[PDB]
């Protein structure tokens, strides 16, 4: 587990929270993200 994504539609036309732990720092953003159907990282 690395992060969480919060919102209502979890797609564009609205804002959505994204928290992600990379390896030494957590990045938190609230952009109007266009999430994928099955989002994940490419470690």
């Amino acid at each position: 587990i690395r992060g969480w994504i919060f919102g209502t539609t979890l797609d564009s036309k609205t804002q959505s929270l994204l928290i992600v732990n990379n390896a030494t720092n957590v990045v938190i953003k609230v952009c109007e993200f266009q999430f994928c159907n099955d989002p994940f990282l490419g470690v």
Partner: protein, 50 residues
Amino acid sequence: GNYNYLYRLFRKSNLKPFERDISTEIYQAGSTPCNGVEGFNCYFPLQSYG
């Protein structure tokens, strides 16, 4: 006339405290779904100050 300042004119519910809504989804004021198409009873929720 300066129209750079906007305000939301319609919304399905009132904002909670310190809530921010920047969505530009077309507000369906009637019973006809808008499907993202503006027209009769389908309005842009934002309006410019005069």
